[PDB]
Symmetry: D2
Subunit: 116 residues, 4 copies
């Protein structure tokens, strides 16, 4: 698990999956759920871990001129999870009207999904 | 190099570094540069490679209920490269007025940096 | 039309609608289409136009301390167009696997939609 | 003020400025500040308001084929505020390591700026 970590309890009512920036929002929703007696854990996929230190170091160390190009990525981890493992996660929490959902909105959807 | 790949020629006038969505734009700037007799290569950092297939499979396979949470990430690879390798890339191409730059804009900045 | 502008010819085979950062990519797809004898225009929705200069000036001019908070927005203009005008645009070009589409990809989808 | 609204009290210790998705996060930071006896208001710049209903309706109503193109925008409102009004907001809360800041982080920076 240099590449993915399961945060929380092994068994849980809900297993969230995310990567990147939504980690913190989910971890708070986990704490709020405990208050209602609902358990949840988080499978967190790490982006650049473990880092290729030696490889990057030996490429850049001999370069004439290096230009870092600012970049970004948006995704549901479900697509790549399905690709690699064959599991198709049917439930998802997507962005809501041009922004990520709030913790209260995430909590809301999460319970809805639980009760579905 | 399951984690980073150097695309193009080992030696080049310019070594671009990126990850995620700007890969394709850079690769075209590489082709445009050749036209002016400028060589460039691309150190591309891969996000979820190699994927933790077995680990993810065994977490999700026993879960009661899985909820994938759509997410995103924005970054200059320079920060993490410096953290891990100690190399501080001084030249960068950032987002320009609320969007990624165009290929022509990237080409422009790239030559400016070359001639600096 | 301080708030929306129609760029190109009044009548066209395809009318693109966008706002924000995809303006430039569309305008190039327009030029590529001409090469194949396909006409296209662009209804461009402007974000902060005309700007509330006087109102903003008189709020900020008397403030003790101002803190600008960097922000963002992601959307299909179709939702708000439907809300306001009742027109439901059925065809759309969405983001493709974690990035905006390339001009060639946009061109491709555009022709597909034309021929549908 | 179909185009910008000042939410909260006219006078305040801190005047936040934002647009788009960070509206909700700021409004909560406002409530948290009250708890410490700090007042704050929010100058909120509206994106597509008032909407050009008639103009859009009459363009799209006669179109052969309409294709909505999903788009996005990232910005500090400071740039355009300076352009239009000549006020240069010196204090800012930017994105922190690849994500928007949390409410606690925003609260933190806000107080730091207050005490600077």
């Amino acid at each position: 698990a240099e590449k993915a970590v399961l945060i929380g309890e092994k068994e849980a009512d809900i297993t969230f999956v995310t990567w990147g920036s939504q980690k913190g929002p989910i971890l708070d929703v986990i704490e709020d759920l405990k208050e209602e007696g609902i358990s949840a854990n988080l499978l967190y996929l790490k982006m650049f871990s473990p880092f290729p230190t030696e490889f990057v170091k030996n490429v850049l160390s001999s370069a004439n001129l290096v230009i870092d190009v600012e970049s970004n990525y948006t995704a549901q981890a479900a697509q790549m999870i399905k690709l690699y493992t064959g599991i198709d996660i049917k439930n998802k929490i997507l962005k809501y009207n041009g922004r990520h959902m709030t913790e209260d909105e995430i909590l809301k959807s999460a319970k809805e999904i639980l009760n579905k």
